[PDB]
Amino acid sequence: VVTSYSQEITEVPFERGSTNSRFTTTLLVKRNLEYYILRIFVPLFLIISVSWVIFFLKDYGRQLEVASGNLLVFVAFNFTISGDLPRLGYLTVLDRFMIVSFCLTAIVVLISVCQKRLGAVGKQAVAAQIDTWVLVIYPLVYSLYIIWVYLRFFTDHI
Amino acid sequence: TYTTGSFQSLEIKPEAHVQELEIRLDKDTRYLTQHTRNLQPGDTFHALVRLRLTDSGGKPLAFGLIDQPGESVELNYTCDQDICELVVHVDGTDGQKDSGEAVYRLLVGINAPNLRESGQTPVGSSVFLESDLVTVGLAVDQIVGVDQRSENFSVVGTLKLSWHDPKLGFSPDQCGCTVKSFEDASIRAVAGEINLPLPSFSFYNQQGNRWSQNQVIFVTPDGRASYFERFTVTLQAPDFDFLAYPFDRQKFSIKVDLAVPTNMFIFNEIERFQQVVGDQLGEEEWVVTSYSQEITEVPFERGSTNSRFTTTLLVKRNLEYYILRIFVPLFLIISVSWVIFFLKDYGRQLEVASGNLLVFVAFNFTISGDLPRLGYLTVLDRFMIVSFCLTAIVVLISVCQKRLGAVGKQAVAAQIDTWVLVIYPLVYSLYIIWVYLRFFTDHI
Ligand SMILES: [Ca+2]
Numbered sequence: 001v002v003t004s005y006s007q008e009i010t011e012v013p014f015e016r017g018s019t020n021s022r023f024t025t026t027l028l029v030k031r032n033l034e035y036y037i038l039r040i041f042v043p044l045f046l047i048i049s050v051s052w053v054i055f056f057l058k059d060y061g062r063q064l065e066v067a068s069g070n071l072l073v074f075v076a077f078n079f080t081i082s083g084d085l086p087r088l089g090y091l092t093v094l095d096r097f098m099i100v101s102f103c104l105t106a107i108v109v110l111i112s113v114c115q116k117r118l119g120a121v122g123k124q125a126v127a128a129q130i131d132t133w134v135l136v137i138y139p140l141v142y143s144l145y146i147i148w149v150y151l152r153f154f155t156d157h158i
Numbered sequence: 159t160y161t162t163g164s165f166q167s168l169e170i171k172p173e174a175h176v177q178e179l180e181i182r183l184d185k186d187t188r189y190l191t192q193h194t195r196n197l198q199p200g201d202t203f204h205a206l207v208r209l210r211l212t213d214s215g216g217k218p219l220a221f222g223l224i225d226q227p228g229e230s231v232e233l234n235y236t237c238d239q240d241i242c243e244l245v246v247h248v249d250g251t252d253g254q255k256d257s258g259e260a261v262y263r264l265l266v267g268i269n270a271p272n273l274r275e276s277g278q279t280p281v282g283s284s285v286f287l288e289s290d291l292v293t294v295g296l297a298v299d300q301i302v303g304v305d306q307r308s309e310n311f312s313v314v315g316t317l318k319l320s321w322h323d324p325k326l327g328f329s330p331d332q333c334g335c336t337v338k339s340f341e342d343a344s345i346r347a348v349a350g351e352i353n354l355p356l357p358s359f360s361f362y363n364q365q366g367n368r369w370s371q372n373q374v375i376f377v378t379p380d381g382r383a384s385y386f387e388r389f390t391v392t393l394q395a396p397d398f399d400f401l402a403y404p405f406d407r408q409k410f411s412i413k414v415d416l417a418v419p420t421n422m423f424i425f426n427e428i429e430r431f432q433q434v435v436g437d438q439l440g441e442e443e444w445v446v447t448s449y450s451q452e453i454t455e456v457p458f459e460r461g462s463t464n465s466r467f468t469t470t471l472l473v474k475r476n477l478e479y480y481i482l483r484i485f486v487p488l489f490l491i492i493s494v495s496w497v498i499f500f501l502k503d504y505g506r507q508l509e510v511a512s513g514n515l516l517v518f519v520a521f522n523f524t525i526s527g528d529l530p531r532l533g534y535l536t537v538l539d540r541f542m543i544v545s546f547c548l549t550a551i552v553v554l555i556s557v558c559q560k561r562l563g564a565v566g567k568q569a570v571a572a573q574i575d576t577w578v579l580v581i582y583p584l585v586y587s588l589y590i591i592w593v594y595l596r597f598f599t600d601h602i
Contacts, residue, residue: 068510069513117501
């Protein structure tokens, strides 16, 4: 979608010692951000929501099963939307966010494994403390990463 | 400026045309051949230092008489033929020998070296009909594509040749305009249009026809012509070796050969009219570590050689992308498959092992989009195979541990568990060290 356009005439050093006249039409275009927000980011936020709410039932075996299943779901969804992800040779803020989300889901799988070990060894108070600590840090980790990426890739003044 | 050309017999002694040079003989150029410019009717050629003098058509004209003082052979000739061209050729290999090096100097004069008697000879004019000196400049604006299965790279850039040909000069008034310009026609096409020699070039590796844009060859009345062309050309790259992908460094070699031998034109000087590699907005897939432009000689299709101007760009992939997207999630999946050996419930461990192997397969194909479908293996493919083998192995070990837990042996199961804990990281580290030694070092 064309945000703005502008036609204007300049001079350019021609092949000889003189200059040629140039007429440049610049169109400021942008993507349909609604499509990416509703197709890529909303299902993703739901997958993180599942991986964050599995820390409520604290059965520690059911939690582990759902954590592994949700990591598999995240992989499958990532490749489902990989069709529109451009196969550019360099990183992108969408790629960076997918990367961070996958690392955090794998980390919650690891924490579920450790919590299951704690539940089996006989330490459940420590397991509950780790559980509530995950509940409090996970949303702030995601918010901090989003703020950091916004500051890095969209601002210079602030 | 003082004008020379053609329009519509005294004091010839001062205008003596006599000059000398030193030569080096080695490798294939044992036989040396030199031409000369058109001569006056009275001019007599004296050759001093076998050797033989013929015309442009090769018809023998004179040999050399060996005079022992001064060594070598002395040759002399004279003719009254008006418009004609003469050639002197010297052969240094009359028999098979090891050789390997030869230093040689010659004495050449078109009228009378006796008057000059060699010496410094400042007023001497070169009469070898020396090859025209063409400067070349090349700039790269983008590397638009790299097809690594077909091993080619499409590159866009600008090319600028510049050569002085007095025969190409003209009177500015006859056409009005000062500069005579031939648009959107190759140097070969212009040489076809006007029956004159021009330094036609080629890229020596392009597949298909390059897109030539803004190409124009314009001549100045003094005779200094210049050719400009913004090309979009798909070069072939045999030198590509993706065995170390994605940690590989590649050479993008853009080689502009001249379609005329070294006798006619040679690339004199590389011209830095524009930044050799352009800086453009964006990270870009291939970042240029270093570039280097240089001129060489290549055996031409005839017995002579042509001048080649090669621009070599040392490019590398954005390794942050591969490390953060391919290797970090891979390390996390491996960490899951290694930490499933802590809970030791032996049924939950098996469930998570199977689920994690499925996760590994799904992630493998998720990142298979960027894995090149090359017909041969790669360090990334090798590491993926090792990871899959180890994950399947931990699935098998989990099955065996579950069997041991069910049979009534749990101490052996715990021993196997801790043994897996201690060997798995060292297995991965050992494999990484081995692949680094195999694919990145020779000294160590
Ligand atoms: Ca760019």
